[PDB]
Design an enzyme around this catalytic site. Structure first.
Site, mmCIF file in Angstrom:
data_model
loop_
_atom_site.group_PDB
_atom_site.id
_atom_site.type_symbol
_atom_site.label_atom_id
_atom_site.label_comp_id
_atom_site.label_asym_id
_atom_site.label_seq_id
_atom_site.Cartn_x
_atom_site.Cartn_y
_atom_site.Cartn_z
ATOM 1 N N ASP A 189 0.419 -8.450 9.290
ATOM 2 C CA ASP A 189 0.639 -7.710 8.082
ATOM 3 C C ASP A 189 2.111 -8.617 7.442
ATOM 4 O OD1 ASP A 189 0.814 -6.145 6.271
ATOM 5 O OD2 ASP A 189 0.705 -4.126 7.420
ATOM 6 N N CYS A 221 -7.455 -4.790 3.965
ATOM 7 C CA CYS A 221 -6.562 -4.991 5.457
ATOM 8 C C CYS A 221 -6.074 -3.494 5.657
ATOM 9 C CB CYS A 221 -5.446 -5.969 4.728
ATOM 10 S SG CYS A 221 -4.646 -5.693 3.161
ATOM 11 N N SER A 222 -4.659 -3.358 5.712
ATOM 12 C CA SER A 222 -4.267 -2.101 6.062
ATOM 13 C C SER A 222 -4.072 -1.417 4.944
ATOM 14 C CB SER A 222 -3.031 -2.490 6.938
ATOM 15 O OG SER A 222 -2.621 -0.857 7.343
ATOM 16 N N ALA A 223 -3.281 -1.885 4.170
ATOM 17 C CA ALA A 223 -2.995 -1.157 2.678
ATOM 18 C C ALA A 223 -3.818 -1.647 1.573
ATOM 19 C CB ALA A 223 -1.427 -1.642 2.275
ATOM 20 N N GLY A 224 -4.323 -2.820 1.918
ATOM 21 C CA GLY A 224 -5.444 -3.225 0.835
ATOM 22 C C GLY A 224 -4.959 -3.941 -0.221
ATOM 23 N N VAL A 225 -3.770 -4.392 -0.277
ATOM 24 C CA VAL A 225 -3.055 -5.085 -1.443
ATOM 25 C C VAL A 225 -2.646 -6.602 -0.993
ATOM 26 C CG1 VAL A 225 -2.475 -2.769 -2.304
ATOM 27 C CG2 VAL A 225 -0.936 -4.046 -0.830
ATOM 28 N N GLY A 226 -2.006 -6.723 0.150
ATOM 29 C CA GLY A 226 -1.310 -7.911 0.350
ATOM 30 C C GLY A 226 -2.362 -9.097 1.022
ATOM 31 N N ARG A 227 -2.833 -8.949 1.800
ATOM 32 C CA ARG A 227 -3.709 -9.978 2.524
ATOM 33 C C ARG A 227 -4.985 -9.893 1.606
ATOM 34 N NH1 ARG A 227 -2.700 -8.204 8.786
ATOM 35 N NH2 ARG A 227 -2.573 -6.053 7.587
ATOM 36 N N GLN A 265 1.436 -9.428 -1.912
ATOM 37 C CA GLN A 265 2.749 -8.651 -1.551
ATOM 38 C C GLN A 265 4.061 -9.296 -1.386
ATOM 39 O OE1 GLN A 265 2.281 -4.359 0.556
ATOM 40 N NE2 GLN A 265 1.319 -6.003 1.623
HETATM 41 O O1 VO4 Z 1 -2.449 -4.552 4.968
HETATM 42 V V1 VO4 Z 1 -1.921 -5.322 3.336
HETATM 43 O O2 VO4 Z 1 -0.360 -4.824 3.760
HETATM 44 O O3 VO4 Z 1 -2.047 -6.921 3.852
HETATM 45 O O4 VO4 Z 1 -2.012 -4.647 2.001
#
Ligand code: VO4
Length: 283
Positions: A189, A221-227, A265
Site C-alpha cells: 500500500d 485494492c484497499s481504498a481503490g485509488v492508488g494501486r 496516489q
Molecule cells: O489500496 V490503495 O491505497 O492502493 O487505493
C-alpha cells in the site's frame, strides 16, 4: 500535452528521471492540481446512511461516475463506493472500487452480477504489515452465499507474484457465470514493487482474460485509488501503444482523475507506470 511517439518514450523517461526526478515531480504535481478549479460532487458518499459503507472517510465516489446498484424493494440501497473509469478508447472500461467490507459483501457481489463483470483485479493483500486492508469476500473453499449470489471456488493457481482464482457464481433470484479473480500478492500500500516486469506480466494476463462482450473489469485494492489507478493507466497505455504506437500517461491520468478521486496516489506510483511501459517497449 499531446501523445508521445513510442519510439521516443524511453528517452522521455530518462529526461523525467534526471535531476532527482524533477520532471516526474512536475508531472505528478500537475496531476494533483488538475482538480483545483473543479468541484466534483459526491453527495451520496457523504450521506449519513452510506457512511458505514465507505472503508475510508476521505475516499469517496464521485456522483457522476458512481456505479449504481438497482434499488431494493432502502432509499440508499443503490450506493456502493465504486466508480466507472474509462479505458483506452472505451468508456466505462473499468469499475474502480474499494476493498469490500463485511457490511458491503452483498452489495459488492450484486454489483458484479448487475454489471455483468467477469474479471476481478485485486491488488492488495487482505492484511499488510499486520494492518487490515481488505476483508475476504470470497470462499476459502467450496461455496459461500452473499445475498442472492452464491459464489463457488472452482480452481486456484498460485504463481510467484499473483494468484488466479476461478469462480462460478449464480443468482438464487439458476443462471451461472464464470468470474476470474486476478490477485497480485506482492504490492505494498502506498508503495511500488522494486521491479516492473512482474506487474507488466500480471497486467497482460489479466487484461487478456477480458471476454467479449462483457461488463467492465472490476479493479480494487484497499481504498481503490492508488494501486488501482496505477493498474488502469498501465493497462490503458499498453492498449494505446498497441493501437497507435503512442503513449499519453499524463493526459490520460488527468482525465480519469475526474472519474474517481486520487487515482494513482503517489509520484512513486506515477514513475512505476512509466517503468512498466518501458519494460513493455524494450521487451
Ligand atoms: O489500496 V490503495 O491505497 O492502493 O487505493
Amino acid at each position: 500535452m499531446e501523445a508521445i511517439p513510442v519510439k521516443q518514450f524511453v528517452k522521455h523517461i530518462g529526461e523525467l528521471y534526471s535531476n532527482n526526478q524533477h520532471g516526474f515531480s512536475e508531472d505528478f504535481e500537475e496531476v494533483q492540481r488538475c482538480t483545483a478549479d473543479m468541484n466534483i460532487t459526491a453527495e451520496h458518499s457523504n450521506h449519513p446512511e452510506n457512511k458505514h459503507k465507505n472503508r475510508y472517510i476521505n475516499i469517496l465516489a464521485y456522483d457522476h461516475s458512481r456505479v449504481k446498484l438497482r434499488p431494493l424493494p432502502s432509499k440508499h440501497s443503490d450506493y456502493i463506493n465504486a466508480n466507472y473509469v474509462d479505458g483506452y478508447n472505451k468508456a466505462k472500461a473499468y469499475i474502480a472500487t474499494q476493498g469490500p467490507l463485511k457490511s458491503t459483501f452483498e452489495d459488492f457481489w450484486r454489483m458484479i452480477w448487475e454489471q455483468n463483470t467477469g474479471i476481478i483485479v485485486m491488488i492488495t493483500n487482505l492484511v499488510e504489515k499486520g494492518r487490515r486492508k481488505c476483508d475476504q469476500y470470497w470462499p476459502t473453499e467450496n461455496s459461500e452465499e452473499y445475498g442472492n449470489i452464491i459464489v463457488t471456488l472452482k480452481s486456484t493457481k498460485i504463481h510467484a507474484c499473483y494468484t488466479v482464482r476461478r469462480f462460478s457464481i449464480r443468482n438464487t433470484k439458476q443462471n451461472e457465470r464464470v468470474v476470474i479473480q486476478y490477485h497480485y500478492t506482492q504490492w505494498p500500500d502506498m508503495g511500488v514493487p522494486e521491479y516492473a516486469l512482474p506487474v507488466l506480466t500480471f497486467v497482460r494476463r489479466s487484461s487478456a482474460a477480458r471476454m467479449p462482450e462483457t461488463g467492465p473489469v472490476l479493479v480494487h485494492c484497499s481504498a481503490g485509488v492508488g494501486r488501482t489507478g496505477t493498474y488502469i493507466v498501465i493497462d490503458s497505455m499498453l492498449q494505446q501503444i498497441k493501437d497507435k504506437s503512442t503513449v499519453n500517461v499524463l493526459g490520460f491520468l488527468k482525465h480519469i482523475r475526474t472519474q474517481r478521486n486520487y487515482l494513482v496516489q503517489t509520484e512513486e506510483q506515477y514513475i512505476f507506470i512509466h517503468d512498466a511501459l518501458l519494460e513493455a517497449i524494450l521487451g
